[PDB]
Amino acid sequence: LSEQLKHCNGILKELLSKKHAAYAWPFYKPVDASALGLHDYHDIIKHPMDLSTVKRKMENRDYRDAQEFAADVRLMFSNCYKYNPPDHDVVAMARKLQDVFEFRYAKMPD
Ligand SMILES: CC(=O)N1CCC[C@@H](Cn2c(-c3cc(C)c(=O)n(C)c3)nc3cc(Br)ccc32)C1
Numbered sequence: 001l002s003e004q005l006k007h008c009n010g011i012l013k014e015l016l017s018k019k020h021a022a023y024a025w026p027f028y029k030p031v032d033a034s035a036l037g038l039h040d041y042h043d044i045i046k047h048p049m050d051l052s053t054v055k056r057k058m059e060n061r062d063y064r065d066a067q068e069f070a071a072d073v074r075l076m077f078s079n080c081y082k083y084n085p086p087d088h089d090v091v092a093m094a095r096k097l098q099d100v101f102e103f104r105y106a107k108m109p110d
Contacts, residue, residue, distance in 0.1 A: 001058075003109055004066040009058055011104050012069075016051055020100060023093035027051050027076060044083050049076040066108060073101055 001009055015024055030050045033041035042048075054072050056062075063069040080094040 001061075002065070005058075005063060005069065007108055008063070008066050008069040008105075011101060012051070012054060012058060014104065015073075015097060015101060016055070020097060023096045024051070026090050026093055027080075027097060031079075038083075041083060045079045047075060047079070049073075049079060051076070066105075070105060074098075077101075 014020065016028070027050055029052050030048055031038065031041060031045075033039065049072050054069070054076070057072065058069065063072075077094050077098045080090060084091050
């Protein structure tokens with residue numbers, strides 16, 4: 001990994017760490033729409049994303065730069081904000097995890 005992608009990988013590790021588990025856990029795995037009874041999910045969300053997918057892509061060297069990584073993390077949050085009413089718990093959890101993400105992403109080395 002490039003220096004910037006090392007920083008990205010560090011962030012990803014943090015987002016998956018026990019430190020943030022109380023609000024990160026809905027983002028660990030793909031939304032299983034059928035299992036959760038969300039029969040409209042894939043009509044509304046055209047491009048699902050979650051942290052396990054981001055992790056697989058990082059491990060497989062799919063991301064060519066930090067921007068591509070960040071786009072997937074933000075897609076995951078955007079999907080949450082798109083699908084869910086803003087007063088649902090999962091949205092509050094997304095906002096908190098995105099705060100973690102954005103503040104550390106901003107510390108990207110040049
Ligand atoms: C609607 C709402 O506020 N919540 C609270 C948090 C959990 C959500 C349901 N859910 C999701 C989930 C659902 C939606 C709609 C979503 O956008 N994300 C990101 C995760 N992933 C889950 C994995 C497992 Br195991 C058990 C329950 C899970 C219900």
